[PDB]
Design a protein around this ligand. Structure first.
Ligand SMILES: [Fe+3]
Ligand SMILES: [Fe+3]
Ligand SMILES: [Fe+3]
Ligand SMILES: [Fe+3]
Lengths: 164, 162
């Protein structure tokens, strides 16, 4: 059997695939940062790529817990270049704002269908998306306040390069 | 340090490693659907290992002065006719990759890029054992006929990979 509906199985599978793209996007942003000598922003993005894969593999395991199957879809080629560190991090946030709506959308579907086990599974991703967004809002506020003082940007590079 | 054409060769390979990760993830989605968690486990560890491969390439390209551009990743197959057919597919994939890496070793050696050929030589060593690992599992699955008792033995054996 499948104790989840197929509209829900598919929204979950759709979201697993979105997390994979998100992982690959941030790896793409790391390539831009690495090319521009910002090895610390690059390490932050690599760490974030790995995080998205953790998100992806939570959806994977939930689908198999509830008797569905996962289908991997093609992954779009992501952007490889941005105009400045700010432009990249703004793209990060717009994407995370998009991931946040995607999750809200799946949670209303689950709620509409009264699949409340999926609602409670998704609550963890709702909370985490607030960190995911504020993470980036914090970096953007610091880049902004940097003016363009390269001493300050490099101070931020090095500290984001300590991400555990 | 490091020419263009070897960069495009090293970049193209980086993308192939990304796809290999994704291929093995899709094999795991098949073993999971069919109820073989041991096999699915092994494929998930393989997929991880494949990302460390792509990032050894990543980080070497930047060590030696080049840029990585990431390309679209093709949809991989989702289903196979039995465990053995899946490992047959994996072996044809690894055989292709190993050859891709030997092919690049001869390009870098042609233009006497000795530090690249030395890096590419660390690796073909580790790849050939990735080939021979997949290769022996297949041989085990061949040996097994389709005796499900033995299929299950390997599923628990392989499910213990770390
Ligand atoms: Fe995520
Ligand atoms: Fe995220
Ligand atoms: Fe590999
Ligand atoms: Fe491989």
């Amino acid at each position: 059997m499948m104790v989840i509906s197929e509209k829900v199985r598919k929204a979950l599978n759709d979201q697993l695939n979105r997390e994979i793209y998100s992982s690959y996007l941030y790896l793409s942003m790391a390539t831009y940062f690495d090319a521009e000598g910002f090895k610390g922003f690059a390490h932050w993005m690599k760490k974030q790529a790995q995080e998205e894969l953790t998100h992806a593999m939570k959806f994977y395991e939930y689908i198999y817990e509830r008797g569905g199957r996962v289908e991997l879809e093609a992954i779009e080629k992501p952007p490889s270049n941005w105009n400045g560190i700010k432009d990249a991090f703004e793209a990060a946030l717009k994407h995370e704002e998009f991931v946040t709506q995607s999750i809200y959308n799946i949670l209303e579907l689950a709620s509409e269908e009264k699949d409340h086990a999926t609602v409670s599974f998704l609550k963890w991703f709702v909370d985490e998306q607030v960190e995911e967004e504020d993470q980036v809002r914090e970096i953007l506020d610091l880049l902004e306040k940097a003016n363009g003082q390269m001493s300050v940007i490099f101070q931020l590079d090095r500290y984001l390069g300590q991400r555990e």
